[PDB]
Structure 1
Amino acid sequence: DGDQMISHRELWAKIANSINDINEQYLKVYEHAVSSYTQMYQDFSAVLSSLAGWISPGGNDGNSVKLQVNSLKKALEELKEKYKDKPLYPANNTVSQEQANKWLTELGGTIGKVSQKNGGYVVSINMTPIDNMLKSLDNLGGNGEVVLDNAKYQAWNAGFSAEDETMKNNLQTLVQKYSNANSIFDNLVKVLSSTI
């Protein structure tokens, strides 16, 4: 109904109510999701740095690689256990199942995963790239340091860097979605100051 009148003063408060609702239920949700994933990937970036001390030349001739997988497996698993309790959304407590499912679609099923903490749910960080690394590590043969000829170190590192490339692509699109979310908020502010 277009005849419904509203004061300029009532309109200012309704705008400030909608803006605050958006920043609280959309902007700050997107920012913390980006926040949690960079810090997750930053800790994984610390394991790639420590990977240098876990790979040295080995073998009879010396062309091969001697990767201590137990040290690398230990670091990737501690990274998993660190972020079981650090979800993308929400930042505090839990929310309903459909609220966790609504923000799973908005963020992406690849980046996040809906989990129940008993009663309430969260959108936890999807650790599929890390878990894919661990089982490929688990299949390398032996339960310790493995001598990897350049042909089969070629195959493992190609898949290891791919799961690393996945988390970067995941972080890139999460950063881009937050960039557009801030731009939608910015435009939504200018469109409403247009009324006065």
Structure 2
Amino acid sequence: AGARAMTDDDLRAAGVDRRVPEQKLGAAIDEFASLRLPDRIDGRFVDGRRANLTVFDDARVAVRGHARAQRNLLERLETELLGGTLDTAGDEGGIQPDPILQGLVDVIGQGKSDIDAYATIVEGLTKYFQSVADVMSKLQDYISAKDDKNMKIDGGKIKALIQQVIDHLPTMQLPKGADIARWRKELGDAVSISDSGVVTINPDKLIKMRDSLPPDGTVWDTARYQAWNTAFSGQKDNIQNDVQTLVEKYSHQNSNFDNLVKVLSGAISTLT
């Protein structure tokens, strides 16, 4: 009933602790960055780190947790504001305007939509993110020491892995009523949005990684592999960068939400 929400504590106490989804999201980014391709050093061969796909796992359901907590607080806030003390003949709701209550309701709905949308988008990017990290581990089965001066890389097969990720790239769908124009500008080049609100991920960075590979059975000297490794790993870093940026935008949204329920709560108090 009394949907209390005046301090960051009141929130957390309700389970709405924005620090968690972002810690996990940070966790993953940390994982994705720890990924390394095999290498050859001083004449030796160094295994790479295969992606701990779990770390990704704990990030997305938290983001899914939070959006439920955020959505259950807004709802509680919204039940309180609409009605409260009755009079006689007024179910009051977009029929006999004049009150400012109306305006808060819409603020709320924008709150809903925003919560959902960032949740779906972040859902998807982390999928995409997990897929790429799956590949940076799967492709390591296709690289190995040949001579004590050469490497073997079955790039034809790695091209295969990368392409599968590109064919089953996570598809996103923005809530009914969103201003797609505002969303394309905010999420940037990393993604593209139709007009039905269908969010898709730009496979451009995966394409360059894919087009960078040699054919299956190639044998490389250490200088050649290093060059490829660096070039490959730099594009991977490029992807980390895109996900990091949306993660900051998402924490900003989590922040906006925190101020939102606060203003809404004092507001209800005011009219209370």
Asked if TM exceeds 0.5, the reply is yes
Task: Give the structure-2-normalised TM-score.
Answer: 0.57
153 and 115 in structure 1: CA distance in 2 versus 1, 3 angstrom threshold: farther
Match of 1:21 among 98, 110, 119: 110
Deviation at 1:191, TM superposition (A): 1.6
**Percentage of matched positions with identical amino acids:** 31
- In structure 2, the residue matched to 1:177 is 249
Larger relative contact order (Cα-Cα within 8 Å, sequence gap ≥ 6): 1
CA distance in 2, matches of 1:52, 1:27: 38
CA distance in 2, matches of 1:128, 1:39: 17
Count of paired positions: 173
Deviation at 1:55, TM superposition (A): 0.4
CA distance in 2, matches of 1:12, 1:91: 23
CA distance in 2, matches of 1:56, 1:112: 35
Gaps of 5+ in 1: 1-6
Q: Do 1:129 and 1:166's aligned partners in 2 also have CA atoms closer than 8 Å?
A: yes
Deviation at 1:129, TM superposition (A): 1.0
Letter in 1 for 2:209: M
- In structure 2, the residue matched to 1:133 is 209
Q: CA RMSD in A?
A: 2.6
Match of 2:145 among 47, 50, 57: 57
* Moved >6 Å (runs of 4+): none
176 and 52 in structure 1: CA distance in 2 versus 1, 3 angstrom threshold: same
Moved more, 13-22 or 128-137: 13-22
Gaps of 5+ in 2: 1-82, 86-98
**TM-superposition CA deviations, 1:101-125 (whole Å, max 9, x none):** 431211111x212457xxx463310
Larger radius of gyration: 2
Q: Do 2:152 and 2:217's aligned partners in 1 also have CA atoms closer than 8 Å?
A: yes
CA distance in 1, matches of 2:211, 2:151: 19
- In structure 2, the residue matched to 1:87 is 171
- In structure 2, the residue matched to 1:3 is none
114 and 14 in structure 1: CA distance in 2 versus 1, 3 angstrom threshold: closer
Deviation at 1:12, TM superposition (A): 5.0
Deviation at 1:184, TM superposition (A): 0.4
Letter in 2 for 1:129: K
Task: Give the structure-1-normalised TM-score.
Answer: 0.77
